[PDB]
């Protein structure tokens, strides 16, 4: 279990996700963006499974729902992430 908190920038949170192509498959961090919030923070790493976002469990959500909740965060607001590796 890994817990972090990232601030939303105009360029995003600084990471890419994969998975969630059907409601039964979990999501994963595919890449970290150079000089992005995820990377300066240094706690997330490629292959990490996304468990929850702002206390909301995302294991069971589609890749589309999760992208939506990440893009739904206003610039400057922060997000609490729980990841498993």
């Amino acid at each position: 279990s890994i817990h972090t908190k990232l601030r939303k920038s105009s360029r995003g949170f600084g990471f890419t996700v994969v998975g969630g192509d059907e409601p039964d498959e979990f999501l994963q961090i595919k890449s970290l963006v150079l000089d992005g919030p995820a990377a300066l923070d240094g706690k997330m790493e490629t292959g990490d499974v996304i468990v929850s976002v702002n206390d909301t469990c995302v294991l069971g959500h589609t890749h589309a729902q999760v992208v939506k909740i990440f893009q739904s965060i206003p610039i400057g607001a922060s997000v609490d992430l729980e990841l498993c590796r």
Partner: peptide, 7 residues
């Protein structure tokens, strides 16, 4: 290569 979305 599966779908990879930046956020």
């Amino acid at each position: 290569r599966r779908r990879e979305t930046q956020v």
